[PDB]
Design a protein around this nucleic acid. Structure first.
Ligand SMILES: Cc1cn([C@H]2C[C@H](O)[C@@H](COP(=O)(O)OP(=O)(O)OP(=O)(O)O)O2)c(=O)[nH]c1=O
Ligand SMILES: [Ca+2]
Ligand SMILES: [Ca+2]
Ligand SMILES: [Ca+2]
Ligand SMILES: [Ca+2]
Ligand SMILES: [Ca+2]
Length: 901
DNA sequence: TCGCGTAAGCAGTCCGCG
DNA sequence: GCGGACTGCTTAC
């Protein structure tokens, strides 16, 4: 097999590399790597190395990496560019793995661990590590075993051994319901004392040294706690055994409001799953506790226990250990679903970066572009300082707030990357500038043609047409990967809908789910077999289909995010290829393209409808248009349609056969107008929306920019078994809106779009009547909470104190003196409830950590004083009044006598 | 919230508006 | 009351 790296580090003048050799074995080596860097040289000086602008460079070979670094400094002192890859480990990987890397995940040691620490005096600070580590569960991917390290004797209590037999039993048997599929994979090691536990953990770690290290909050908690605790007990040299090169560094992570410390373990790649989740999941969650996320992702119940966590070990050590094991397994279950580890490996090996660098599109693209240019003996420019400067973005059309009955939407495939490729936008393809006219003059095709030589953007920039830039070339490669995976995603989605249909008529049989590849549209034979399956088998197939869809979604959307991140990186000052000329070339072309095609679509439709000046495009945002189809439907007549699916088909055909050719013609003209390198503006139909045939549903409404709802029957070629709501921006989509309120508002919208005004009025009346019985957590607002200290004036709110911050200060006063009470963590999320006047908390709201029950110290008083009236008006009624006035109906039946009878 | 971009919405504070 | 200036937070793209 081909060799591949596992990790790479620079330590002084050595590269330390862990890798898999040609026999599939893990090895480590220290290499005295001599880097090269570059300087411009005379034309007379024959060379094979050229910078990206074609200027000749001489290569400078250094005796060692420190000399290379010192040379860069002196070049700055002189005031000359020092060219080349200054991150020497990326250069090392480029030299050592000068081929497309084929990796084998089965050889990569992926470790998932979690620790427990009993603490009676509040949160156990990792930087102090003053409490014993009393449990570690460490799952190893190569062994496929859960290694459980259990402390039996502690200053906080001596306990009995954990019982695997009780752990396996149902909770209804008094057990812990540790999943049966992992029971035989548990290797249980009890310890008489903490020193022997930790010494054994370190010997184990030595034997089975993680390459990828993950878990939940491991980077911010478990790793620093373990490192500092071992440091406290044994000394630094022992703690550094967590690094295979015995090198560690305290790294200070800074943000706007403060900083925190992590421990960098050289020769390990830490991918904390909470951070993978935040980057790759495209959720915004009210809470990021593992319980909350597990429930959300897996539909597993919360891990239940009595009393505070600080007393769990002494009261119920059995459960204590079982929950530590389950916590590790839940992360593995989330990854089986979401596949973020697989994603990180793919992207990291593609770029030839340290795997942990997948968190950084700047680093990822820097490496991709360096490797690409190096192949041609081209030399990358030095990174430079730039002041941060604002620049313009996308165009968003102001919609007329209204109901909109029939809507067809269209948008560009990978808009910004497509613009890059079409215009040929790249650092080295800049050809010059032209004299810009107002944007509207380009939109209306009255401005002078910018160039007869070069490919142009309406921001004034011109680009070469003879050759693709490195940015277009490399962005195309990732886009193509994205496109492949999106194909699989949509296939699994469509396959999912076939199963849902078949589920209307399940067979009374005992059979099995079919063995199929859900990434490909089911053949006729598979469809026939599905129609004969039991509900049981169908449901199992649906679950598998949806898991395949999720896998495709992860692969596609994060490749989309990477290529989109390159367009954004051009506008970030730390990017080697930062250039506002290029960043604004993209966005300004985008603005033009949307408004150009709006004009073209309106023109086309006015022509087919025989009108003038009618606005068929009602909305657009960045790269999208929403087209009113009322007139199209009315031209055949609603009476002519057999059912909902009939007019959906008719609009689908109209979009494909009439609209899309019209749009394509519009964009080809624009391409020629801008003299672009290649026409790549592909604006495909997204959604077909409308009320159910014969209903009083309104179909859709807009309240304003970035705020709308549609009842969608077909989305990017997926024809739904049941209509689906596409809701953007409205309170149903915001993590700040209470859970039960999102649900209620969604049902109000459903009724509006599908059933009409009377149905809406029915539901509102019921919700208003019953909501006071909703669980307090389900009706609490949510907010991130920054700058708690800034607004805290002796325990009370200072000037301009935000409402949620006020809530926290109230909480802080109410729990004062308690070290055991849960603390609100700066920068994390809180639940927020309003309080009625005259309450014992002395203020109008209280807040507490999100994803948790409020402490029993004050729960009863919070419940008694909760202001349901304010809660209802603020979170439910106010948004609903916005929706209904926009859509021109009433959520309450207006008095129009009779009545009178 | 360490790790790519801008546009733009709503809640809430403070305070004017005769 | 509500709007504008402003801070804070969150979402669409
Ligand atoms: C979603 C998203 C979009 N954008 C910008 C770049 C996108 O090309 C542009 C349009 O957004 P989208 O239409 O969401 O995405 P897309 O056109 O890149 O991909 P698709 O083929 O799935 O439609 O908006 C970002 O800069 N960051 C983001 O997170
Ligand atoms: Ca725990
Ligand atoms: Ca798009
Ligand atoms: Ca599309
Ligand atoms: Ca059947
Ligand atoms: Ca779009």
């Amino acid at each position: 097999m081909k060799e591949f790296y596992l990790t790479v580090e620079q330590i002084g003048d050595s590269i330390f590399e862990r890798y898999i050799d040609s026999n599939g074995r893990e090895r480590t080596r220290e290499v005295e790597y001599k880097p090269s860097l570059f300087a411009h040289c005379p034309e007379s000086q024959a060379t094979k190395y050229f910078d990206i602008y074609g200027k000749p460079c001489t290569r400078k070979l250094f005796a060692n990496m420190r000399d290379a670094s010192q040379w860069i400094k002196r070049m700055e002192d002189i005031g000359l560019e020092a060219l080349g890859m200054d991150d020497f480990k990326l250069a090392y990987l480029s030299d050592t793995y000068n081929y497309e890397i084929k990796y084998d995940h089965t050889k990569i040691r992926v470790a998932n661990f979690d620790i427990e620490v009993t603490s009676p005096d509040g949160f156990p600070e990792p930087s102090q590590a003053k409490h014993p580590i009393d449990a570690i569960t460490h799952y190893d991917s190569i062994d496929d075993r859960f290694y459980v390290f259990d402390l039996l004797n502690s200053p906080y209590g001596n306990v009995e051994e954990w019982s695997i037999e009780i752990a396996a039993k149902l909770q209804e048997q008094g057990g812990d319901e540790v999943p049966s599929e992992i029971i035989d994979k548990i290797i249980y090691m009890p310890f008489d004392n903490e020193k022997e536990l930790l010494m054994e953990y370190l010997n184990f770690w030595q034997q089975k040294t993680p390459v990828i290290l993950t878990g939940w909050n491991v980077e911010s908690f478990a790793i620093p706690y373990v490192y500092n605790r071992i440091k406290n007990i044994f000394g630094e040299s022992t703690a550094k055994r967590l690094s295979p090169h015995r090198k560690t560094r305290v790294k200070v992570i800074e943000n706007m409001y403060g900083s925190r410390e992590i421990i960098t373990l050289f020769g390990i790649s830490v991918l904390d799953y909470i951070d993978l989740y935040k980057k790759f999941s495209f959720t915004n969650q009210p809470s990021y506790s593992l319980d909350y996320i597990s429930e959300f992702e897996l539909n597993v119940g919360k891990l239940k226990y009595d009393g505070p966590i600080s007393k769990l070990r002494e009261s119920n050590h059995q459960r204590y250990i079982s929950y530590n094991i389950i916590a590790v397994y839940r992360v593995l279950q989330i990854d089986a679903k979401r596949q973020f580890i697989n994603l990180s490996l793919d992207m990291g090996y593609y770029a030839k970066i340290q795997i942990q660098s997948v968190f950084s599109p700047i680093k990822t693209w820097d490496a991709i572009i360096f490797n690409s240019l190096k192949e041609q003996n081209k030399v990358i420019p030095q990174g430079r300082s730039h002041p941060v400067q604002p620049y313009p973005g996308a165009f968003v059309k102001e919609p007329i707030p209204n109901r909109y009955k029939y809507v067809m939407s269209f948008d560009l495939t990978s808009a910004y990357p497509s613009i890059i490729r079409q215009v040929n936008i790249s650092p080295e393809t800049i050809a010059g500038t032209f004299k810009v006219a107002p944007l509207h003059d380009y939109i209306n095709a009255v401005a002078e043609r910018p160039s007869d030589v070069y490919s142009c953007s309406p921001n004034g920039m011109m680009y070469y047409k003879d050759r693709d830039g490195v940015v277009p070339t490399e962005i195309t490669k990732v886009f193509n990967q994205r496109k492949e995976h999106k194909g699989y995603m949509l296939a699994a989605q469509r396959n999912g809908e076939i199963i849902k249909e078949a589920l209307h008529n399940p067979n009374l049989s005992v059979d099995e789910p079919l063995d199929v590849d859900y990434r490909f549209d089911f053949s006729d034979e598979i469809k026939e077999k599905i129609k004969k399956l039991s509900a049981k088998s169908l449901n199992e197939m649906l679950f598998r289909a949806q898991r395949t869809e999720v896998a495709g979604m992860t692969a596609q959307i994060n490749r989309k995010a990477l290529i989109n991140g390159l367009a954004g990186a051009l506008g970030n000052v730390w990017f080697r290829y930062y250039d506002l000329r290029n960043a604004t070339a993209i966005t300004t072309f985008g603005q033009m393209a949307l408004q150009w095609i709006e004009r073209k679509v309106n023109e086309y439709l006015n022509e087919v409808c025989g009108t003038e000046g009618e606005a068929f495009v009602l909305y657009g945002d960045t790269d999208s248009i929403y087209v009113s189809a009322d007139k199209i439907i009315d031209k055949v007549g609603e009476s002519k349609f057999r059912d909902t699916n009939h007019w959906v088909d008719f609009l689908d055909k109209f979009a494909r056969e009439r609209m899309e050719p019209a749009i394509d013609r519009g964009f080809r003209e624009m391409c020629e107008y801008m003299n672009n390198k290649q026409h790549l503006m592909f604006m495909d139909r997204e959604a077909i929306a409308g009320p159910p045939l014969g209903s009083k549903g309104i179909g859709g409404f807009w309240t304003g920019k970035k705020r709308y709802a549609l009842n969608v029957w077909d989305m990017e070629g997926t024809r739904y078994a049941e209509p689906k709501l596409k809701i953007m921006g409205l309170e149903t989509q915001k993590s700040s809106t209470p859970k039960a309120v999102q649900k209620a508002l969604k049902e109000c919208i459903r009724r509006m779009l599908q059933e009409g005004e009377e149905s809406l009025q029915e539901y509102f009346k019921e919700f208003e009547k019953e909501f006071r019985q909703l669980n307090y957590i389900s009706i609490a607002s949510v907010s991130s909470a920054n700058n708690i200290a800034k607004y805290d004036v002796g325990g009370f709110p200072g000037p301009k104190c935000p409402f949620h911050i006020r809530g926290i200060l109230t909480y802080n006063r109410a729990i004062k003196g308690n070290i055991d009470a849960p603390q609100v963590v700066e920068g994390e999320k809180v639940y927020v409830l309003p309080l009625r006047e005259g309450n014992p908390f002395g203020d109008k709201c209280i807040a507490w950590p999100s994803g948790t029950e409020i402490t029993d110290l004050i729960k009863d008083d919070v419940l008694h004083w909760m202001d349901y009236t304010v809660l209802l008006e603020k979170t439910f009624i106010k948004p609903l009044e916005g929706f209904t006035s926009a859509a021109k109906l009433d959520y309450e039946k207006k008095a129009s006598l009779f009545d009178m009878f």
